[PDB]
């Protein structure tokens, strides 16, 4: 039949007391109706992505598309909450978390959250890099922004904006924040799949922004269309940063990449008082110990234009570089024991690679010291990966603390031309080399992979080629 | 990093009066020279409510 | 200038400017100061004036504003929000029928 078949999975939403079965038990009553929601929902959605239901649900007489519009308008807060759900699944939005303000919200819709399927166990950079670096495809027609294409003009038409206009203004807390960021999804989402025709006219808003600048409506009404606006805006900032790195093996990589590619392309004085001042406020020197010194000065003394240990020839700055290389020294266990969950971690190891970088320039001076580091992280390796015969079990220590985040230490160091070459005198390429032939070690050859830097030649795409050959299957998986 | 381009506007400010402000020597270091990428260009809002929870 | 400029590309200009007309609506009524009003008005009659397009959906708000200031019980104001209308019955063909009586 022609409107009475297909509907009748409609009916769940559109009636407000709906009773499929005449005889049944009043003891789950409530949690029929739940359930009833719940296959209603799988049933909307299955009939709008094949094309003989997406005709005969919009057809341009009476359709059931309308009255699923028409039945939002209506201050109902059981129908509109269901409904919601149905959109978003509709255009495969990801959903938010359910809360009063829109920040909290806002926070949980970025493309750049965290996923459970980046962790060293699981994929540790290709998972990760796959949903942050956009596709290498610029021509080729993507289908699916087709369907979606269709999709969306079908709704406008009906005036599905006008509807979700009222859901915002006309709505509890919870709903409203809901409704607004699916507003911003759709705007954003049809300014680059809808052609121009179709969109030069939907990035107004003529109902929304009449209600805004309007003192003869309550106000109560007025500043919630305004304070609309506003929380749209900074959506907008959202999709204009774009994904951004959450793992500083990831970082590195795309700080180095854009560096070699704006350097083809052909500040202060730092007197001696301006470190003194500084260095004393460092907190390093009067007390030896940890967690009390001031890590932001600690950092900025170290990348300053100028202070390169070579241009400012002082004692207490030699004090100082020795006082921090004691901290970092993989022998010296005071920061490998220190937990993943440290709430600063992120600051400690940045300030790590930050401080490797800075003996590095004082090739003359700072090698003496760079030299130390170095040694030791090899022979860290030869315990902590087992070729010694003796432990072969320092697996669980690696991946519960800090001592993982040392392949960036060493990483960091093969971007410059001096750095490869200190690293044959401290033969740490041969360590690394050895170990690719580990059947049982898999997470410690997920870490060599992504922390060399293959942009020049040398030994470093030696032992990338020896690991996507010579490894274990899984292993030469990942590489 | 919106800010990067005010340096030359303060920076002959202070180099005439010899001004020499421990927190805003931390900030203009971590502009010139990079520091993170999540951290540079974000919102303040969801920074602020981050701290907050 | 990012009138003009907004006709090019919607997408950057229009989310600012939205914020951006009602806090120039926002002075008009709740500043009670005839300067800061003289100000608000010369702004909008640029906006309206370089990007007719835009404006011609907000005919009902900004009109309704201006004819409440002219029957207000200063020379600087008069001045410029007769000008302002001068360009709102221009962009609105035969849409300002109902406030010429």
């Not at chain 1, 407000?16 to 789950?28: I, L």
């Not at chain 1, 799988?42 to 009939?47: E, L, S």
Request: glycine share 4%; hydrophobic share 40%; net charge positive.
């Amino acid at each position: 039949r022609a409107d009475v078949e297909l509907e009748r999975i409609l009916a769940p939403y559109t009636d407000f007391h709906y009773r499929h079965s005449p005889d049944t038990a009043e003891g789950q009553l409530k949690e029929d109706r739940e359930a009833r929601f719940l296959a209603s929902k799988m049933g909307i959605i299955a009939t709008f992505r094949s094309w003989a239901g997406i005709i005969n649900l919009c057809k341009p007489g009476n359709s059931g598309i309308q009255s699923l519009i028409g039945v939002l308008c209506i201050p109902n807060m059981e129908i509109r909450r269901g409904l919601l759900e149905v959109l978003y699944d509709i255009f495969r939005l990801p959903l938010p978390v359910v809360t009063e303000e829109f920040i909290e919200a806002l926070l949980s819709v970025d493309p750049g959250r965290f996923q459970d399927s980046w962790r060293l166990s699981d994929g540790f950079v290709a998972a990760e890099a796959k949903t942050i670096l956009p596709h290498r495809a610029r021509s080729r027609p993507d289908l699916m922004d087709n369907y979606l294409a269709l999709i969306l003009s079908a709704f406008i038409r009906n005036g599905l904006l006008e509807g979700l206009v009222e859901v915002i203004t006309n709505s509890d807390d919870h709903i409203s924040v809901r409704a607004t960021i699916l507003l911003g999804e759709l705007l954003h989402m049809a300014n680059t799949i809808l052609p121009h025709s179709h969109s030069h006219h939907l990035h107004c808003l003529p109902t929304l922004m009449n209600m805004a600048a309007s003192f003869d409506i309550p106000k109560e009404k007025r500043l919630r269309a305004s304070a609309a606006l506003n929380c749209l805006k900074r959506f907008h900032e959202m999709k204009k940063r774009g994904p951004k790195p959450y793992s500083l093996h990831l970082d590195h990589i795309i700080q180095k990449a854009i560096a070699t590619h704006q350097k083809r392309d052909q500040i202060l004085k730092d007197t001696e008082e301006a470190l003194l001042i500084n260095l004393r406020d460092s907190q390093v020197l009067q007390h030896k110990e940890n967690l009390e010194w001031n890590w932001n000065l600690i950092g900025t003394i170290l990348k300053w234009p100028n202070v390169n240990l070579r241009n400012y020839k002082d004692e207490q700055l030699h004090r100082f570089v020795r006082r921090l290389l004691y901290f970092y020294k993989p022998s010296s266990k005071l920061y490998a024991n220190l937990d993943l969950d440290f709430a600063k971690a992120k600051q400690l190891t940045v300030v790590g690679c930050q401080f490797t970088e800075f003996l590095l320039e004082s090739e003359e001076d700072g090698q003496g010291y760079l030299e130390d580091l170095v040694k030791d992280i090899v022979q860290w390796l030869n315990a902590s990966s087992g070729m010694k015969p003796e432990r072969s079990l320092q697996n669980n220590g690696l991946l519960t603390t800090l001592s993982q985040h040392y392949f960036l230490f060493i990483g960091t160091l093969s971007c410059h031309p001096h750095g490869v070459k200190m690293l044959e005198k401290c033969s740490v390429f041969q360590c690394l080399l050895n170990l690719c032939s580990l059947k049982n070690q898999d997470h410690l050859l997920k870490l060599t992979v992504s922390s060399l830097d293959y942009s020049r030649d040398g030994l470093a795409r030696v032992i990338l080629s020896k690991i996507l050959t010579a490894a274990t299957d899984a292993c030469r998986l990942y590489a | 990093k919106k800010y990067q381009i005010f340096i030359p506007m303060v920076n002959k400010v202070l180099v005439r009066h010899r001004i020499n402000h421990q927190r805003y020597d931390v900030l203009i270091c971590r502009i010139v020279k990079g520091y993170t990428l999540a951290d540079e260009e974000e919102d303040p809002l969801i920074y602020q409510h981050r701290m907050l929870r | 200038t990012v009138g003009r400029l907004s006709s090019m590309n919607p997408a950057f200009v229009m989310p600012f400017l939205r914020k951006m007309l009602i806090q120039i609506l926002t002075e008009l009524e709740h500043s009670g100061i005839g300067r800061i009003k003289e100000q608000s008005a010369r702004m909008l009659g640029h906006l309206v004036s370089n990007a007719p397009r835009l404006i011609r959906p907000y005919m009902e708000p900004i009109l309704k504003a201006l004819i409440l200031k002219l029957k207000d019980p200063n020379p600087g104001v008069i001045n410029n929000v007769l000008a302002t209308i001068g360009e709102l019955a221009q962009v609105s063909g035969l849409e300002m029928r109902k406030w010429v009586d």
